[PDB]
Amino acid sequence: MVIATIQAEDHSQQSGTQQETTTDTGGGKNVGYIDAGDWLSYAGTPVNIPSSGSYLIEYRVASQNGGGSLTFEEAGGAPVHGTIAIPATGGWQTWTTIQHTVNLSAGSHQFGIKANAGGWNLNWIRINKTH
Ligand SMILES: OC[C@H]1O[C@@H](O[C@H]2[C@H](O)[C@@H](O)[C@H](O[C@@H]3[C@@H](O)[C@H](O[C@H]4[C@H](O)[C@@H](O)[C@H](O)O[C@@H]4CO)O[C@H](CO)[C@H]3O)O[C@@H]2CO)[C@H](O)[C@@H](O)[C@@H]1O
Ligand SMILES: [Ca+2]
């Protein structure tokens, strides 16, 4: 089941990005202007992970030219949970949902996202239990 949908713009701390209106389905905002080394923290909204095992993490992303990469991690930078490439969608507001599985320990987590490479926008993240 879905543990949580986290809107990208609901970060508690960030470095180097900016919010903008999104035209994706449902409206609201996206995080843009993401460059290599930029980061977002969700430490202000802890997410309880009910059991140790596999979780499918989904990212609602847009990218004009491609080349982007992110790491899904614990806020602060360690441990790291996984990395995923962001494909080109051909527009800054042409959206798609990408997916990877990570393995998480049970308990209270504070998540963060680090941009390894830029060129992508983020609308929201969804964390799913798949074990
Ligand atoms: O890897 C070496 C390179 O590091 C670059 O700087 C990194 C830095 O080493 C790394 O620790 C940092 O991780 C951030 C982390 O600082 C930040 O912590 C937040 C926290 O989430 C927030 O809740 C709290 O309020 O404030 C903290 C900041 O004081 O969390 C994010 C998300 O988890 C982490 O990615 O990131 C830096 C930038 O990439 C150097 O710039 C480079 O010179 C060096 O070679
Ligand atoms: Ca930036």
Ligand SMILES: [Ca+2]
């Ligand atoms: Ca959003």
Ligand SMILES: [Cl-]
């Ligand atoms: Cl970059």
